[PDB]
From TrEMBL:
Spans through the membrane: none
Coiled coil: none
Name the UniProt record assigns to this protein: Green fluorescent protein
Originating species: Aequorea victoria (Water jellyfish)
Biological processes, Gene Ontology terms: bioluminescence; generation of precursor metabolites and energy
Keywords, sorted A to Z: Chromophore, Luminescence, Photoprotein
Signal peptide span: none
Amino acid sequence: SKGEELFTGVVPILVELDGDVNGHKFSVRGEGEGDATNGKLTLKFICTTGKLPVPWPTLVTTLVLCFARYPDHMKQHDFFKSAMPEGYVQERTISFKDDGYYKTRAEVKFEGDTLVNRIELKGIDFKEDGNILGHKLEYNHNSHNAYITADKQKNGIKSNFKIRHNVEDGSVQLADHYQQNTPIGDGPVLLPDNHYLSTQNALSKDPNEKRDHMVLLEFVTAAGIT
């Protein structure tokens, strides 16, 4: 639909994150490419301030749903692409069970030929000996479904979902996500019927990279509408 023609091929991506968790300031920069026809993302993220003070897996959801594969019968429900190129604001609260929370605010928009995700993150109330600041999470990210609903009052969408992070002792750390997206422009956006996104992620390391970093492969596909 509207905005779909910006995503017909492979698109370069830039991600910039400025973060502060319990007063520990950090910065992350990512680059790679996205292919919405297959729902595929290929990115490499570097911490540009030293060692990341939180586990890389806790930043995956924060670090571009316009690259989701929406099948033909659902093309009228793709809010994310319909907002382009002006883009959208993506805001989340992420509550970690028995621990602190992240608040994130991002702008996702085209800057010329590159899709850019610029994020501010604040982390508050974390336990210095918990799973997050204590670095106790496995280096992976399991698959999740996220239900998308229309926020007709704000011409946007909303979503809430739980991420289950594997803990190195065999337990699970829950991260409860509430999300709200609002268009930056005022043109015709698509407000969808209820549906969901299915996401898979694989995390790896570049052997020739010396900085603290994360190589990320992601697949996102839409479903739930007949």
